[PDB]
Protein backbone atom coordinates (compact mmCIF):
# COMPACT_ATOMS: atom_id res chain seq x y z
CA UNK A 1 0.00 0.00 0.00
CA UNK A 2 2.53 2.57 1.23
CA UNK A 3 5.23 3.74 -1.24
CA UNK A 4 7.75 5.31 1.14
CA UNK A 5 8.83 4.64 4.72
CA UNK A 6 10.33 6.96 7.35
CA UNK A 7 13.04 6.03 9.82
CA UNK A 8 10.33 5.59 12.47
CA UNK A 9 8.61 3.16 10.10
CA UNK A 10 11.84 1.20 9.66
CA UNK A 11 12.35 1.11 13.42
CA UNK A 12 8.78 -0.27 13.79
CA UNK A 13 9.80 -2.85 11.24
CA UNK A 14 12.83 -3.75 13.34
CA UNK A 15 10.59 -4.57 16.32
CA UNK A 16 8.20 -6.68 14.24
CA UNK A 17 5.46 -4.05 14.32
CA UNK A 18 5.29 -3.23 10.61
CA UNK A 19 4.66 -6.62 9.02
CA UNK A 20 3.68 -8.36 12.24
CA UNK A 21 4.77 -11.42 14.27
CA UNK A 22 6.70 -14.07 12.36
CA UNK A 23 7.32 -11.84 9.38
CA UNK A 24 10.18 -9.79 7.90
CA UNK A 25 12.19 -7.51 10.16
CA UNK A 26 14.96 -5.07 9.56
CA UNK A 27 17.88 -4.96 11.98
CA UNK A 28 17.87 -2.45 14.81
CA UNK A 29 20.77 -0.11 15.43
CA UNK A 30 23.59 -0.65 15.18
CA UNK A 31 23.17 -3.09 12.29
CA UNK A 32 20.45 -0.98 10.60
CA UNK A 33 22.03 0.73 7.53
CA UNK A 34 18.97 2.47 6.09
CA UNK A 35 17.33 5.66 7.36
CA UNK A 36 14.46 5.87 4.88
CA UNK A 37 12.83 4.20 1.90
CA UNK A 38 12.11 7.00 -0.53
CA UNK A 39 10.36 4.78 -3.10
CA UNK A 40 9.11 1.24 -3.28
CA UNK A 41 6.88 -0.24 -5.97
CA UNK A 42 6.10 -3.55 -7.61
CA UNK A 43 6.52 -2.04 -11.08
CA UNK A 44 9.31 -0.11 -12.84
CA UNK A 45 12.95 -0.66 -12.02
CA UNK A 46 15.41 -2.00 -14.55
CA UNK A 47 13.38 -5.21 -15.11
CA UNK A 48 9.92 -3.70 -14.73
CA UNK A 49 9.24 -6.07 -11.82
CA UNK A 50 9.75 -3.71 -8.91
CA UNK A 51 12.11 -1.20 -7.39
CA UNK A 52 13.35 0.24 -4.11
CA UNK A 53 15.21 3.45 -3.48
CA UNK A 54 16.55 4.04 0.05
CA UNK A 55 18.96 6.38 1.81
CA UNK A 56 21.36 6.45 4.75
CA UNK A 57 22.51 9.82 6.10
CA UNK A 58 26.24 9.98 6.79
CA UNK A 59 27.93 11.98 9.51
CA UNK A 60 31.47 11.68 10.95
CA UNK A 61 30.42 10.12 14.25
CA UNK A 62 28.77 6.94 13.00
CA UNK A 63 30.29 4.10 14.93
CA UNK A 64 31.90 2.13 12.16
CA UNK A 65 34.22 5.01 11.12
CA UNK A 66 36.33 4.86 14.32
CA UNK A 67 37.11 1.16 14.11
CA UNK A 68 37.24 0.68 10.28
CA UNK A 69 39.94 1.69 10.05
CA UNK A 70 41.91 3.52 12.72
CA UNK A 71 43.55 6.53 10.97
CA UNK A 72 41.75 5.58 7.71
CA UNK A 73 37.99 5.90 8.17
CA UNK A 74 35.76 4.30 5.54
CA UNK A 75 32.32 2.74 5.69
CA UNK A 76 32.57 -1.04 5.62
CA UNK A 77 31.58 -2.22 2.11
CA UNK A 78 29.90 -5.23 3.71
CA UNK A 79 27.43 -2.98 5.53
CA UNK A 80 26.34 -1.26 2.29
CA UNK A 81 26.02 -4.68 0.71
CA UNK A 82 23.92 -5.77 3.72
CA UNK A 83 21.61 -2.78 3.30
CA UNK A 84 20.84 -4.20 -0.15
CA UNK A 85 19.99 -7.63 1.19
CA UNK A 86 17.88 -6.14 3.96
CA UNK A 87 16.00 -4.10 1.38
CA UNK A 88 15.23 -7.20 -0.70
CA UNK A 89 13.88 -8.91 2.46
CA UNK A 90 11.81 -5.81 3.19
CA UNK A 91 10.38 -5.98 -0.30
CA UNK A 92 9.27 -9.56 0.27
CA UNK A 93 7.52 -8.55 3.51
CA UNK A 94 6.02 -5.47 1.88
CA UNK A 95 4.47 -7.76 -0.74
CA UNK A 96 2.66 -9.59 2.08
CA UNK A 97 4.62 -12.86 2.24
CA UNK A 98 4.92 -14.49 5.66
CA UNK A 99 8.18 -15.42 7.27
CA UNK A 100 11.55 -14.21 8.42
CA UNK A 101 14.39 -13.18 6.16
CA UNK A 102 17.73 -14.77 5.47
CA UNK A 103 20.11 -13.54 2.79
CA UNK A 104 21.06 -16.34 0.45
CA UNK A 105 23.94 -14.62 -1.33
CA UNK A 106 24.86 -12.83 -4.55
CA UNK A 107 26.37 -13.08 -8.00
CA UNK A 108 29.02 -10.54 -8.82
CA UNK A 109 29.72 -7.85 -6.22
CA UNK A 110 31.94 -4.90 -7.17
CA UNK A 111 33.29 -2.15 -4.96
CA UNK A 112 34.80 0.70 -6.95
CA UNK A 113 34.50 3.60 -4.50
CA UNK A 114 34.05 4.49 -0.84
CA UNK A 115 32.03 6.36 1.75
CA UNK A 116 34.11 8.77 3.78
CA UNK A 117 33.07 10.45 7.09
CA UNK A 118 32.79 13.69 5.08
CA UNK A 119 30.01 12.22 2.91
CA UNK A 120 26.45 13.45 3.33
CA UNK A 121 24.26 10.67 1.97
CA UNK A 122 24.36 7.10 0.64
CA UNK A 123 21.66 5.96 -1.80
CA UNK A 124 20.63 2.40 -2.48
CA UNK A 125 18.91 1.44 -5.69
CA UNK A 126 17.34 -2.01 -5.93
CA UNK A 127 15.82 -3.53 -9.05
CA UNK A 128 13.73 -6.65 -8.48
CA UNK A 129 14.61 -9.25 -11.10
CA UNK A 130 12.44 -12.22 -10.14
CA UNK A 131 10.29 -13.51 -7.32
CA UNK A 132 10.10 -17.26 -6.70
CA UNK A 133 7.27 -19.09 -4.92
CA UNK A 134 8.31 -22.74 -4.64
CA UNK A 135 7.76 -24.22 -1.21
CA UNK A 136 9.53 -21.11 0.10
CA UNK A 137 9.51 -17.54 -1.26
CA UNK A 138 12.59 -15.72 -2.47
CA UNK A 139 13.60 -12.76 -4.57
CA UNK A 140 16.45 -12.09 -6.93
CA UNK A 141 17.53 -8.47 -7.42
CA UNK A 142 20.29 -6.29 -8.75
CA UNK A 143 21.43 -3.37 -6.67
CA UNK A 144 23.68 -0.39 -6.58
CA UNK A 145 25.06 1.83 -3.83
CA UNK A 146 25.86 5.47 -4.50
CA UNK A 147 27.35 8.23 -2.38
CA UNK A 148 26.52 11.84 -3.03
CA UNK A 149 25.44 11.16 -6.58
CA UNK A 150 28.28 8.81 -7.46
CA UNK A 151 27.87 5.07 -7.88
CA UNK A 152 30.39 3.13 -5.80
CA UNK A 153 29.12 -0.49 -5.53
CA UNK A 154 27.16 -2.96 -7.61
CA UNK A 155 25.68 -6.39 -6.85
CA UNK A 156 24.13 -8.69 -9.44
CA UNK A 157 21.73 -11.39 -8.41
CA UNK A 158 21.19 -10.62 -4.75
CA UNK A 159 19.12 -13.46 -3.30
CA UNK A 160 17.05 -13.29 -0.11
CA UNK A 161 14.54 -15.85 1.10
CA UNK A 162 11.70 -15.93 3.64
CA UNK A 163 11.55 -18.70 6.22
CA UNK A 164 8.59 -19.62 8.39
CA UNK A 165 11.05 -21.73 10.40
CA UNK A 166 14.76 -21.00 10.68
CA UNK A 167 15.33 -23.73 13.27
CA UNK A 168 16.81 -25.91 10.53
CA UNK A 169 18.56 -23.16 8.51
CA UNK B 170 56.35 -13.29 6.22
CA UNK B 171 57.81 -15.67 8.81
CA UNK B 172 55.20 -15.75 11.57
CA UNK B 173 52.53 -18.38 10.65
CA UNK B 174 49.99 -17.85 13.39
CA UNK B 175 48.61 -14.69 15.06
CA UNK B 176 46.92 -14.21 18.47
CA UNK B 177 44.09 -11.82 19.22
CA UNK B 178 46.64 -9.38 20.62
CA UNK B 179 48.59 -9.61 17.34
CA UNK B 180 45.37 -8.81 15.48
CA UNK B 181 44.55 -5.85 17.72
CA UNK B 182 48.11 -4.68 17.08
CA UNK B 183 47.37 -4.96 13.37
CA UNK B 184 44.20 -2.87 13.78
CA UNK B 185 46.32 0.03 15.17
CA UNK B 186 48.69 -0.11 12.20
CA UNK B 187 51.43 -1.61 14.35
CA UNK B 188 51.85 -5.10 12.87
CA UNK B 189 52.71 -4.14 9.28
CA UNK B 190 53.36 -0.49 10.03
CA UNK B 191 51.98 2.92 9.09
CA UNK B 192 50.52 3.26 5.59
CA UNK B 193 50.14 -0.55 5.36
CA UNK B 194 47.33 -3.13 5.81
CA UNK B 195 45.13 -2.97 8.88
CA UNK B 196 42.36 -5.05 10.29
CA UNK B 197 39.27 -3.31 11.71
CA UNK B 198 39.11 -2.71 15.44
CA UNK B 199 36.21 -3.87 17.56
CA UNK B 200 33.39 -3.83 16.90
CA UNK B 201 34.05 -4.38 13.20
CA UNK B 202 36.79 -6.97 13.81
CA UNK B 203 35.37 -10.45 13.09
CA UNK B 204 38.43 -12.63 13.79
CA UNK B 205 39.97 -13.67 17.14
CA UNK B 206 42.99 -15.55 15.82
CA UNK B 207 44.78 -16.69 12.70
CA UNK B 208 45.68 -20.32 13.30
CA UNK B 209 47.47 -20.82 10.00
CA UNK B 210 48.78 -18.60 7.23
CA UNK B 211 51.12 -19.74 4.44
CA UNK B 212 52.04 -18.87 0.85
CA UNK B 213 51.75 -22.52 -0.20
CA UNK B 214 49.07 -25.21 0.03
CA UNK B 215 45.40 -24.33 0.04
CA UNK B 216 43.19 -25.48 -2.82
CA UNK B 217 45.26 -23.71 -5.54
CA UNK B 218 48.69 -24.35 -4.03
CA UNK B 219 49.22 -20.62 -3.77
CA UNK B 220 48.45 -19.91 -0.12
CA UNK B 221 46.03 -20.45 2.71
CA UNK B 222 44.64 -18.85 5.81
CA UNK B 223 42.67 -20.47 8.57
CA UNK B 224 41.18 -18.12 11.20
CA UNK B 225 38.68 -18.36 14.03
CA UNK B 226 36.05 -16.21 15.74
CA UNK B 227 34.82 -17.36 19.17
CA UNK B 228 31.03 -17.06 19.55
CA UNK B 229 29.14 -16.26 22.72
CA UNK B 230 25.52 -15.08 23.22
CA UNK B 231 26.58 -11.58 24.23
CA UNK B 232 28.27 -10.52 20.99
CA UNK B 233 26.71 -7.15 20.14
CA UNK B 234 25.15 -8.02 16.79
CA UNK B 235 22.85 -10.71 18.19
CA UNK B 236 20.60 -8.29 20.09
CA UNK B 237 19.90 -6.00 17.09
CA UNK B 238 19.98 -8.60 14.27
CA UNK B 239 17.25 -9.47 14.77
CA UNK B 240 15.03 -8.68 17.72
CA UNK B 241 13.49 -12.03 18.71
CA UNK B 242 15.48 -13.93 16.06
CA UNK B 243 19.18 -13.60 16.81
CA UNK B 244 21.63 -14.56 14.03
CA UNK B 245 25.10 -13.39 13.08
CA UNK B 246 24.89 -11.05 10.08
CA UNK B 247 26.14 -12.91 7.01
CA UNK B 248 27.75 -9.73 5.78
CA UNK B 249 30.12 -9.78 8.78
CA UNK B 250 31.36 -13.30 8.10
CA UNK B 251 31.79 -12.34 4.49
CA UNK B 252 33.77 -9.26 5.62
CA UNK B 253 36.06 -11.41 7.71
CA UNK B 254 37.01 -13.18 4.46
CA UNK B 255 37.87 -9.90 2.77
CA UNK B 256 39.84 -8.71 5.78
CA UNK B 257 41.83 -11.92 5.79
CA UNK B 258 42.70 -11.48 2.12
CA UNK B 259 43.86 -8.00 3.06
CA UNK B 260 45.98 -9.33 5.89
CA UNK B 261 47.54 -11.89 3.49
CA UNK B 262 48.74 -9.14 1.22
CA UNK B 263 50.08 -7.19 4.21
CA UNK B 264 51.77 -10.35 5.49
CA UNK B 265 53.47 -10.81 2.09
CA UNK B 266 55.23 -7.46 2.67
CA UNK B 267 53.30 -5.32 0.16
CA UNK B 268 52.79 -1.63 1.04
CA UNK B 269 49.42 0.14 1.07
CA UNK B 270 45.99 0.12 2.71
CA UNK B 271 43.33 -2.46 1.94
CA UNK B 272 40.05 -1.99 0.11
CA UNK B 273 37.85 -4.97 -0.79
CA UNK B 274 37.09 -4.95 -4.50
CA UNK B 275 34.23 -7.50 -4.35
CA UNK B 276 33.48 -11.09 -5.13
CA UNK B 277 32.45 -13.42 -7.89
CA UNK B 278 29.71 -15.34 -6.16
CA UNK B 279 28.53 -15.46 -2.50
CA UNK B 280 26.34 -18.20 -0.96
CA UNK B 281 24.78 -18.33 2.48
CA UNK B 282 23.37 -21.77 3.25
CA UNK B 283 23.33 -21.72 7.01
CA UNK B 284 23.69 -19.51 10.07
CA UNK B 285 25.48 -18.71 13.29
CA UNK B 286 23.21 -18.73 16.30
CA UNK B 287 24.15 -17.30 19.71
CA UNK B 288 24.43 -20.91 20.99
CA UNK B 289 27.34 -21.63 18.59
CA UNK B 290 30.89 -22.07 19.97
CA UNK B 291 33.15 -21.21 17.06
CA UNK B 292 33.30 -19.85 13.51
CA UNK B 293 36.18 -20.89 11.29
CA UNK B 294 37.27 -19.09 8.14
CA UNK B 295 39.17 -20.96 5.41
CA UNK B 296 40.77 -18.84 2.68
CA UNK B 297 42.43 -20.34 -0.40
CA UNK B 298 44.55 -17.82 -2.33
CA UNK B 299 43.97 -18.26 -6.09
CA UNK B 300 46.13 -15.54 -7.61
CA UNK B 301 48.15 -12.46 -6.67
CA UNK B 302 48.28 -9.64 -9.25
CA UNK B 303 51.05 -7.01 -9.50
CA UNK B 304 49.89 -4.53 -12.16
CA UNK B 305 50.85 -1.09 -10.82
CA UNK B 306 48.82 -1.85 -7.73
CA UNK B 307 48.70 -5.21 -6.00
CA UNK B 308 45.60 -7.29 -5.39
CA UNK B 309 44.65 -10.85 -4.51
CA UNK B 310 41.87 -13.17 -5.61
CA UNK B 311 40.85 -15.96 -3.21
CA UNK B 312 38.01 -18.39 -2.55
CA UNK B 313 36.73 -18.77 0.98
CA UNK B 314 34.36 -20.63 3.27
CA UNK B 315 32.84 -19.87 6.66
CA UNK B 316 32.00 -22.79 8.97
CA UNK B 317 30.38 -22.95 12.39
CA UNK B 318 31.10 -25.80 14.83
CA UNK B 319 32.16 -28.14 11.99
CA UNK B 320 29.48 -27.23 9.42
CA UNK B 321 30.21 -25.23 6.28
CA UNK B 322 27.65 -22.44 6.00
CA UNK B 323 28.95 -19.77 3.55
CA UNK B 324 31.13 -19.76 0.48
CA UNK B 325 32.58 -17.03 -1.69
CA UNK B 326 34.31 -17.48 -5.03
CA UNK B 327 36.75 -14.91 -6.33
CA UNK B 328 37.05 -12.59 -3.35
CA UNK B 329 39.13 -9.62 -4.46
CA UNK B 330 41.06 -7.23 -2.23
CA UNK B 331 43.52 -4.54 -3.27
CA UNK B 332 46.21 -2.46 -1.61
CA UNK B 333 46.14 1.25 -2.25
CA UNK B 334 49.10 3.46 -1.48
CA UNK B 335 46.67 6.41 -1.97
CA UNK B 336 42.96 6.00 -1.18
CA UNK B 337 42.16 9.63 -2.01
CA UNK B 338 41.24 8.67 -5.57
CA UNK B 339 39.35 5.51 -4.66
Ligand SMILES: Nc1cccc(Oc2ccccn2)c1
Pocket residue numbers: 082085086089101102103104160244245246247248281283284285
Ligand atom coordinates in the same frame (compact mmCIF):
# COMPACT_ATOMS: atom_id res chain seq x y z
N1 LIG C 1 17.04 -10.54 5.75
C1 LIG C 1 18.37 -10.70 5.85
C2 LIG C 1 19.22 -9.95 5.04
C3 LIG C 1 20.59 -10.09 5.18
C4 LIG C 1 21.12 -10.99 6.10
C5 LIG C 1 20.27 -11.82 6.82
O1 LIG C 1 20.79 -12.62 7.80
C6 LIG C 1 21.48 -13.77 7.46
C7 LIG C 1 22.27 -14.33 8.46
C8 LIG C 1 22.92 -15.55 8.26
C9 LIG C 1 22.73 -16.23 7.07
C10 LIG C 1 21.97 -15.63 6.06
N2 LIG C 1 21.29 -14.46 6.29
C11 LIG C 1 18.91 -11.61 6.75
Ligand SMILES: Nc1cccc(Oc2ccccn2)c1
Pocket residue numbers: 074075076077078111112113114115252255256259270271272273274330
Ligand atom coordinates in the same frame (compact mmCIF):
# COMPACT_ATOMS: atom_id res chain seq x y z
N1 LIG D 1 40.71 -4.28 3.55
C1 LIG D 1 39.38 -4.25 3.44
C2 LIG D 1 38.69 -5.45 3.49
C3 LIG D 1 37.30 -5.41 3.47
C4 LIG D 1 36.63 -4.20 3.29
C5 LIG D 1 37.32 -3.02 3.08
O1 LIG D 1 36.62 -1.83 3.08
C6 LIG D 1 36.03 -1.32 1.96
C7 LIG D 1 35.18 -0.24 2.14
C8 LIG D 1 34.67 0.45 1.03
C9 LIG D 1 34.98 0.03 -0.25
C10 LIG D 1 35.80 -1.09 -0.41
N2 LIG D 1 36.39 -1.67 0.70
C11 LIG D 1 38.70 -3.05 3.24
